[PDB]
Chain A
Amino acid sequence: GWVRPDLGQLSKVTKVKTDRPLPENPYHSRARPEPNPVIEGDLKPAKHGTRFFFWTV
């Protein structure tokens, strides 16, 4: 009773059911280093201007 598969049929992606659990960390990767703390708040003008030598503003 074996029917030969048609052209294109064997190359399909198929879904399969398995009792095996899904690996959680297949790469055995470490924990990523924590990002730099972000600085928050609203912008204010530079305090006393540019402060470049003798320039007042």
Chain B
Amino acid sequence: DGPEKNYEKTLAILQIESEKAELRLKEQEVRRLMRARGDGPWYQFPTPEKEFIDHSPKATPDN
């Protein structure tokens, strides 16, 4: 084939590898912020379940 095919497939390969590179760097930035601040969907560490708190009137009033 002519030189155009290899030349333009290289650009296609370059675009993919470049975009994977920036996606790889961005994930590490996201993970760092999510783990330090706990404000994202990841690194959500468990806390006690509130559905097992008893809310009934107790034997004594001041509870």
Contact = CB atoms under 8 A, between A and B. Distances in A.
Interface residues of A, number: 5
Contact of B40 (A36, A47, A48, A51): A36
Nearest to B37: A36
A48 B23 contact: yes
**What interface size band does chain B fall in?**
under 10
A22 interface: no
Interface in A7-57: 36, 39, 47-48, 51
Contacts of A39: 41
Nearest to B57: A13
Interface of A: 36, 39, 47-48, 51
